[PDB]
Design a protein around this ligand. Sequence first.
Ligand SMILES: O[C@@H]1[C@@H](O)[C@H](O[C@@H]2CO[C@@H](O)[C@H](O)[C@H]2O)OC[C@H]1O
Ligand SMILES: O[C@@H]1[C@@H](O)[C@H](O[C@@H]2CO[C@@H](O)[C@H](O)[C@H]2O)OC[C@H]1O
Ligand SMILES: O[C@@H]1[C@@H](O)[C@H](O)OC[C@H]1O
Ligand SMILES: O[C@@H]1[C@@H](O)[C@H](O)OC[C@H]1O
Length: 302
Amino acid sequence: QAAQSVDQLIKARGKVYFGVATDQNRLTTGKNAAIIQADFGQVTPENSMKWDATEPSQGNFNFAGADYLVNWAQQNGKLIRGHTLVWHSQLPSWVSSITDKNTLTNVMKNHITTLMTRYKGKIRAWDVVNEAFNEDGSLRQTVFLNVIGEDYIPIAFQTARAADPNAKLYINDYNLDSASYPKTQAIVNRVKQWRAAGVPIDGIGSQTHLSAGQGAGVLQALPLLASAGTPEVAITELDVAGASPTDYVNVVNACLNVQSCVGITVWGVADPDSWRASTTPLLFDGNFNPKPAYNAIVQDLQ
Ligand SMILES: O[C@@H]1[C@@H](O)[C@H](O[C@@H]2CO[C@@H](O)[C@H](O)[C@H]2O)OC[C@H]1O
Ligand SMILES: O[C@@H]1[C@@H](O)[C@H](O[C@@H]2CO[C@@H](O)[C@H](O)[C@H]2O)OC[C@H]1O
Ligand SMILES: O[C@@H]1[C@@H](O)[C@H](O)OC[C@H]1O
Ligand SMILES: O[C@@H]1[C@@H](O)[C@H](O)OC[C@H]1O
């Protein structure tokens, strides 16, 4: 645990939170629980709420890991971001084997409804749809798009809002780090069109999985993302190859510059536990000590 809390400091700047991804296996080992307790104010289940973990068989739900995280979060007063409802990855084979429009639609709705009602009122935001865009801005051809068509997105969001009107509904994606990139512009145009049609998209989530030097691009990309008109936008799965303080400060400043940016979520605590460990992209090293990037963010926020 570090002496200065980036979450407390970001709160003093007028933002809602600075959080991290985690799960039961992380919370019960290392110094993870201590660091999240003292330095962060929000958590996102890294894997316990995905489709493969929660509904391995149709109608046969498993909330073990998910229940653990929510309970731990409430007890410690940490905000929660549900992650993630509709995604083509980590999807049970029984889902992708469905070729009937009606069936897949009801199945997708049942999945969304069940997960969201179980935690009704306890989740700040949900990543309803994850990675729905191709790099060129076109909609990714997944089983949902193929079987249901474009309407699967409006349906998912409409169903989510019905399940828990208290949560902020987000569409989440990566590679939205440059204002000139086609994907970035496309999501802004698509969200604008959807909202104009009454689809309840409260926020755009920007994963922000960066490589060295890409932090500078976010200074322009976030404001562009914000121009879609959504109530909120957020940095949802931040990590930077090399963990340079320059890149990290740039992403934080980008959020401080955009009024609709509610907060930032870093994808993990310690480097070795990162899904990109080989690039030591996190704010804490293997010894669970804060890295220069952590101290630079703190100095920047104070
Ligand atoms: O639309 C709302 C924004 O007006 C709000 O903006 C915050 C206001 O306080 C400032 O200190 C913060 O920097 C800024 O983000 O954010 C929430 C949103 O709902
Ligand atoms: O522990 C790993 C997770 O960190 C990883 O999380 C995904 C990373 O890519 C993002 O686009 C997704 O939103 C996020 O869920 O998933 C694999 C797991 O092994
Ligand atoms: O069961 C939990 C699992 O769902 C999560 O993905 O990782 C931690 C485990 O304890
Ligand atoms: O698998 C995806 C990966 O390609 C991207 O870089 O980050 C998000 C992940 O979901």
